Amino acid sequence: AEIQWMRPSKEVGYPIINAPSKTKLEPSAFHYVFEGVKEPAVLTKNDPRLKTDFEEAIFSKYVGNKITEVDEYMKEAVDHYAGQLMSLDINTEQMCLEDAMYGTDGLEALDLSTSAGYPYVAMGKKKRDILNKQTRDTKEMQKLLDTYGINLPLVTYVKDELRSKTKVEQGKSRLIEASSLNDSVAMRMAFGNLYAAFHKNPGVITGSAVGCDPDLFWSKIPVLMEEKLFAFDYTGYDASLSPAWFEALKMVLEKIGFGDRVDYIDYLNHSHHLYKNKTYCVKGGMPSGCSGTSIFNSMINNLIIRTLLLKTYKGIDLDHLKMIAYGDDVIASYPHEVDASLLAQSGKDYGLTMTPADKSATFETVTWENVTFLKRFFRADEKYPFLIHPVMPMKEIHESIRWTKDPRNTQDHVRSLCLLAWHNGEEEYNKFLAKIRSVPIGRALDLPEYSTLYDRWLDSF
């Protein structure tokens, strides 16, 4: 993606946006009980750890667009994917403001904790001041729509999250481009049924994993995959999507019944931003905080993988391409072996930066033994092999448990980690519970034992 221009918000009539400067993260009761190397990302220029201009580093993700034209391959990719989706019979109807707000089957209600973006972020108005979960009141929202309309600037914040030492010293913090509650609502009405259809059909038909429950879904993946697996990582996926990938996305939407509101896709692609006191225009790239971001990123990944295969392996049978994406992350397969390294080359022509799966030195064969999806490995249950365990590495869990954003959610944070950890084995799990219980805070938590989680799991199928 590329910033077209940038200048003082006041110059163009926009109020300054004040974003916190102090991280809400801090050592937790288990900070010294477990090993960890990650710490809060840099949130301001005045951060002792910085080793380069912050402002300069957070915007270094923008380096241009290598392409701006949907070629022949991309068009064929569009047709094949669009064709697959056609078989789901996605409801092309628009979603009523009520369901678009408080949810329906296939779509959760709006996240009240997340920013309501402009103009409500400099208007001091929050989300609970516009909707009530038990009321189902559209009235307020409706007036707000009619008043400010849509296509409002995206409020840009630095993301408060753990980052390695390096990325802290190089001010490599990630940015949250929050959308106005107005747009988010419009888009859920425009694509609401598309979203639901995807959430209800994680797999190789939607080629999506969004909405999935790893505890159950992991056992279905091997059955959906073809003989030979292949994968790779992306560097700066969102920012790397050229405008052409958005046009191809629109072509797909048009072909499945949504040519109706494809303009919305233009706002994702060519976006208007508000960061601090400045305002800027971005051409290309996916914004991190818009309605559907996850789903559209996955749809585009399906288009991407297909395109690179058509350009590298003419005559390939896409109908035997079995892949599942979740944003940039993907697990794919084909009846025959393919060269990820080659594919990584073709992708470079399309602006994509593909590298060896899970930071490997080079492109090695991908197997059920080493493949990962959503950071989770795949391990057959030692007693009932047909049941597959999604195995998140302890290191991730250790890193995460060493901090906290609110003592009141400690019970939940630790419980959640437990639902991830036990898949590593009873031995490992008990060592984990043991260390948690080696401090006062831990001992006061209500945590599930191994046999309890293993039995619940077996019955859930």
Curated annotation (Swiss-Prot):
<feature type="topological domain" description="Cytoplasmic">
    <location>
        <begin position="1"/>
        <end position="461"/>
    </location>
</feature>
<feature type="domain" description="RdRp catalytic">
    <location>
        <begin position="227"/>
        <end position="342"/>
    </location>
</feature>
<comment type="function">
    <text>Replicates the viral genomic RNA on the surface of intracellular membranes. May form linear arrays of subunits that propagate along a strong head-to-tail interaction called interface-I. Covalently attaches UMP to a tyrosine of VPg, which is used to prime RNA synthesis. The positive stranded RNA genome is first replicated at virus induced membranous vesicles, creating a dsRNA genomic replication form. This dsRNA is then used as template to synthesize positive stranded RNA genomes. ss(+)RNA genomes are either translated, replicated or encapsidated.</text>
</comment>
<comment type="subunit">
    <text>Interacts with Viral protein genome-linked and with protein 3CD.</text>
</comment>
<feature type="binding site">
    <location>
        <position position="233"/>
    </location>
    <ligand>
        <name>Mg(2+) 1</name>
    </ligand>
</feature>
<feature type="binding site">
    <location>
        <position position="328"/>
    </location>
    <ligand>
        <name>Mg(2+) 1</name>
    </ligand>
</feature>
<feature type="binding site">
    <location>
        <position position="233"/>
    </location>
    <ligand>
        <name>Mg(2+) 2</name>
    </ligand>
</feature>
<feature type="binding site">
    <location>
        <position position="328"/>
    </location>
    <ligand>
        <name>Mg(2+) 2</name>
    </ligand>
</feature>
<protein>
    <recommendedName>
        <fullName>RNA-directed RNA polymerase</fullName>
    </recommendedName>
</protein>
